[PDB]
Amino acid sequence: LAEALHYAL
Ligand SMILES: [Co+2]
Protein backbone atom coordinates (compact mmCIF):
# COMPACT_ATOMS: atom_id res chain seq x y z
CA LEU A 1 0.00 0.00 0.00
CA ALA A 2 2.48 2.67 1.14
CA GLU A 3 4.46 2.54 -2.07
CA ALA A 4 1.52 1.98 -4.45
CA LEU A 5 0.28 5.29 -2.99
CA HIS A 6 3.60 7.13 -3.33
CA TYR A 7 3.71 6.05 -6.99
CA ALA A 8 0.11 7.09 -7.72
CA LEU A 9 0.78 10.49 -6.11
CO1 LIG B 1 8.02 5.74 -1.41
Short mmCIF file of C-alpha atoms in Angstrom, two decimals, chain A:
data_model
loop_
_atom_site.label_atom_id
_atom_site.label_comp_id
_atom_site.label_asym_id
_atom_site.label_seq_id
_atom_site.Cartn_x
_atom_site.Cartn_y
_atom_site.Cartn_z
CA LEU A 1 0.00 0.00 0.00
CA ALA A 2 2.48 2.67 1.14
CA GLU A 3 4.46 2.54 -2.07
CA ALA A 4 1.52 1.98 -4.45
CA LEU A 5 0.28 5.29 -2.99
CA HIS A 6 3.60 7.13 -3.33
CA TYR A 7 3.71 6.05 -6.99
CA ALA A 8 0.11 7.09 -7.72
CA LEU A 9 0.78 10.49 -6.11
#
